[PDB]
Structure formats: structure tokens, C-alpha cells
Write a protein that binds this DNA or RNA. Structure first.
Ligand SMILES: *[C@@H]1O[C@H](CO)[C@@H](O[C@@H]2O[C@H](CO)[C@@H](O[C@@H]3O[C@H](CO[C@H]4O[C@H](CO)[C@@H](O)[C@H](O)[C@@H]4O[C@@H]4O[C@H](CO)[C@@H](O[C@@H]5O[C@H](CO[C@]6(C(=O)O)C[C@H](O)[C@@H](NC(C)=O)[C@H]([C@H](O)[C@H](O)CO)O6)[C@H](O)[C@H](O)[C@H]5O)[C@H](O)[C@H]4NC(C)=O)[C@@H](O)[C@H](O[C@H]4O[C@H](CO)[C@@H](O)[C@H](O)[C@@H]4O)[C@@H]3O)[C@H](O)[C@H]2NC(C)=O)[C@H](O)[C@H]1NC(C)=O
Ligand SMILES: *C[C@@](*)(O)[C@H](CCCNC(N)=[NH2+])NC(=O)[C@@H]1CCCN1C(=O)[C@H](N)Cc1ccccc1
Ligand code: NA
Ligand code: NA
Lengths: 31, 259
DNA sequence: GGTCAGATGATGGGGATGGGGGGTTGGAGGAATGGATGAC
């Protein structure tokens, strides 16, 4: 089972593109 | 999902839709953790109080979907179940403690742009990411409103729904409900004064509560949509199965047999 | 005078499938009754 490449989205991470509300999560991590 | 928004094509490739064969009916959500493994809430498969108790050949599993019901030709893969595994200390009598189940596919599923598994978190990722105020993301084709009561606006969405929601301190969860909480669950969603809305509703169960690590840049499944009381009610918080507190059991079944 | 039963009937009509005509994917063929009409 291909579990070494999990969590990386063919249409997002694998293309260095972000989803339209992704940063919202990252910015939550600031505190 | 209440107060959500329409998913972008393939922003949750691990989103798995659990489906009843006959009569054809969407039951729950699920997440793809492997090419051969799928993770859901126990209560989608076994809830005696509602005379619910399914079998491998009762259910289908549709992967890589966007549109809620229609067959998305050349995109979605439909897999059958080889074996259903429910946590043997899942407590359906009381408070859905350990609302977790694993589902083994007969064949592995070919990955694509639309199909790709999510990571389970390790000790550190859990410690690092599961903190009050940190936002995770829920997704599903569940209800847009409480449908058991008279309301207006549609009942179910026509494409996958997404909402991001902050984890909530255990003291708050504890007393937002009169249902006994557990260490095997966490609650999430905006507080009333935070002036923002959102929740998982009925039909969203088994759906992943995922978070994205700013270190390795990977998406991790932290929770499973478990339960709630109404949808998007003020002072009410969605409750999720705590994936990491149950990883020992997950790993124990996944790796039990040589693939 | 009003029950009854095949019966022919446009019309709105996929398909593991909506509204369309490409999409996150081809390229065609198309659901399932309705209410007027002799036989008594
Ligand atoms: C939700 O719904 C489900 C139903 O959908 C419901 O569960 C059902 O309801 C009852 C449970 O309370 C139960 O009833 C029983 O059934 C007894 C017979 O059951 C067997 O019948 C057929 C085959 O004959 C199967 O279709 C059944 O699944 C069942 O087979 C057994 O099931 C057990 C439990 O899951 C399995 O054990 C697992 O085995 C694993 C390893 O497996 C093997 C192995 O070694 O490789 C498999 C091998 O094939 C087998 N050897 C061979 C070649 O045969 C060996 C072998 O069994 C042993 O190893 C050697 O000793 O095992 C692991 O070990 C794993 O950990 C383990 O879980 C297994 O597949 C299989 N074998 C066994 C152990 O038999 C009836 O006898 C009984 O009637 C009455 O008889 C008694 C005696 O006279 C009497 O005293 C009493 O009054 C009894 O009532 C009764 O009708 C249903 O079977 C059950 N179905 C299922 C799917 O489990 C849930 O409760 C419900 N939930 C709720 C709460 O709503
Ligand atoms: C199975 C899932 O689709 C569903 C999701 C509910 C999520 N709701 C919110 N607001 N996040 N779960 C349920 O409906 C579960 C299973 C049956 C009972 N239940 C509930 O959440 C009840 N509404 C409350 C409850 C009853 C009994 C035990 C625990 C909770
Ligand atoms: Na709320
Ligand atoms: Na089409």
C-alpha cells in the first residue's frame, strides 16, 4: 500500500498550488 | 456540512463516500488511509439503538467523488468491502466512545488526481497540532441544516462541502453538553462570540477532520466526524473521534496480515 | 350513463449519472405515465 506519499495532493502540493482557504489553517497555528 | 462551501476539484482526494447497495442511499463519509484501507465512524456500520448493523456485502465505497449522487464517469472508483473491523471497545450503549471502524477493500484502488490517501499522525504531530484554537477542516455530503425540523433551504448539497473549524479546549467541550465526553474524542467549532459559523451535520459521520502540518507540508487526519447536538447551534460544538489516541489499534489491524 | 381496461400517445425523455452539448469525463440515445375511447 502506497502510504509513503500520503497527505500530498496531486492537484495542490504536487504542483505547489494552494486551495482557496488553506492559509486560514496555517494562520491558525500562529498562536 | 452546515455553513460550509463547495469543495475545489480534488482538495480532499481521501474523501470516501459510504453507500448502501439496496436501497441505494448515501450513509456516511470515510477517509482513504491506504490503497486497501478506509477509515470511518463505527456508528455508520453498527448502531443497535437504531436497528443499524451492516455487512461487507451490504455496502459500497465510492472514491474520488465531487458530485453527490450521480456516477462521475472516468473519475470515481467504486470498491467493495472484504472485511469490516469495528473497535472492540466501541460503546454504542452510551456516548459513541471510540467511534471508529476500518474497512478493507477487496482490490487496492488506483490513485489519481482525485484519489489519494491522507496521513495518520504520529505522537509528535498530534502533540504539535492538536491545540485549542488551531483550525482543522471537515468535509462531507451531509445535511446543510437540521432536516428533522421544519426549515427552508435545501436538505443535502449537490457537491462535496468544506468548512474549517477551530479545536476547542476540553473544559468548554465538557460542559457544552450533558453527554459524557472522553479522551477518545475532541470537539471543534467557533464559540458564539467569535461571530463565525460552521459544523458537521447528519450524514457527515466518518468524514475526516484533517489538519495540514507547516513542517512537512502534509495533510493529516486528526479526527473522524462522530456526533453533535443539532447542527450549528450556538454554544454547541461538533465532536470528533480522536484518531491519534486510537492509532495503536489502527496500526494493529492494518499491519496484522501480509498484503 | 358512468365503471373498465387495454391501448396508442406525444413529450420529455441516457447511462452505475443532471442538465445538458463540457465538466473533475465521451458521445450519443432517451422515463414512465395520462384521460379519451369502445364494450357493458
Ligand atoms: C450485528 O449482526 C451480526 C449478524 O449479522 C450479529 O452477529 C451474529 O449473531 C450471533 C452473535 O451473537 C451469531 O449467532 C451464532 O452463530 C453461531 C455460528 O456462527 C458461525 O456461523 C457461520 C459458519 O458456520 C458464519 O457465517 C458465522 O460468522 C459464524 O462463524 C464464526 O464467526 C466467528 C465470529 O466472527 C469467527 O471467529 C473469528 O475467527 C478468526 C479466525 O478464523 C478461523 C481460523 O482459524 O482461521 C476461520 C476458520 O474458517 C475456522 N475454521 C474452519 C475451517 O471452519 C476457525 C475456527 O472457527 C476456530 O479457529 C477453531 O476453533 O476460525 C479469529 O479467531 C477472530 O478473532 C474470530 O473473531 C469465525 O469466522 C467463525 N468460526 C467460529 C468461531 O465458529 C451459532 O453456533 C450460534 O447458535 C447457537 O449454538 C450454540 C452451540 O450449540 C448454542 O450454545 C448457543 O445457544 C448459540 O446461540 C448462534 O446462532 C452469528 O454467527 C453472528 N454473525 C456473525 C457475522 O458473527 C451481531 O451480534 C450484531 N450486533 C448487534 C449487537 O446487534
Ligand atoms: C453518524 C453521523 O452522520 C452523525 C453526525 C452528527 C454530527 N453533528 C454535529 N453537529 N457535528 N452522528 C450522529 O447522528 C450520532 C449517532 C446517533 C446519535 N448521534 C448524535 O450525534 C446525536 N444527535 C446525539 C447523540 C446521541 C447519542 C449518543 C451520542 C450523541
Ligand atoms: Na456551533
Ligand atoms: Na453527460
Amino acid at each position: 500500500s502506497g502510504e509513503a506519499d500520503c497527505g500530498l495532493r496531486p492537484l495542490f502540493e504536487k504542483k505547489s498550488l494552494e486551495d482557496k482557504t488553506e492559509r486560514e489553517l496555517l494562520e491558525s497555528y500562529i498562536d | 456540512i452546515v455553513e460550509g462551501s463547495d469543495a475545489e476539484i480534488g482538495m480532499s482526494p481521501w474523501q470516501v463516500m459510504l453507500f448502501r447497495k439496496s436501497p441505494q442511499e448515501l450513509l456516511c463519509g470515510a477517509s482513504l488511509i491506504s490503497d486497501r484501507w478506509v477509515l470511518t465512524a463505527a456508528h455508520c456500520l453498527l448502531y443497535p439503538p437504531w436497528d443499524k448493523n451492516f455487512t461487507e456485502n451490504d455496502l459500497l465505497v465510492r472514491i474520488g467523488k465531487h458530485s453527490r449522487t450521480r456516477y462521475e464517469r472516468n473519475i470515481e472508483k467504486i470498491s467493495m468491502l472484504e472485511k469490516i473491523y469495528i473497535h472492540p471497545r466501541y460503546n454504542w450503549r452510551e456516548n459513541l466512545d471510540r467511534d471508529i471502524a476500518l474497512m478493507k477493500l477487496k482490490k487496492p484502488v488506483a490513485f489519481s488526481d482525485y484519489i489519494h490517501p491522507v496521513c495518520l499522525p504520529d505522537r509528535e504531530t498530534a502533540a504539535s497540532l492538536l491545540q485549542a484554537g488551531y483550525k482543522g477542516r471537515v468535509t462531507g455530503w451531509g445535511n446543510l441544516k437540521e432536516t428533522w425540523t421544519a426549515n427552508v433551504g435545501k436538505g443535502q448539497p449537490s457537491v462535496l462541502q468544506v468548512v474549517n473549524l477551530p479545536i476547542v479546549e476540553r473544559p468548554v467541550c465538557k460542559d457544552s453538553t450533558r453527554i459524557r465526553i472522553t479522551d477518545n474524542m475532541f470537539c471543534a467549532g467557533y464559540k458564539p462570540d467569535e461571530g463565525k459559523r460552521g459544523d458537521a451535520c447528519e450524514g457527515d459521520s466518518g468524514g475526516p477532520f484533517v489538519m495540514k502540518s507547516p513542517f512537512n507540508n502534509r495533510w493529516y487526519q486528526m479526527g473522524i466526524v462522530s456526533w453533535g447536538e443539532g447542527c450549528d447551534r450556538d454554544g454547541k460544538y461538533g465532536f470528533y473521534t480522536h484518531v491519534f489516541r486510537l492509532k495503536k489499534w489502527i496500526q494493529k489491524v492494518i499491519d496484522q496480515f501480509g498484503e
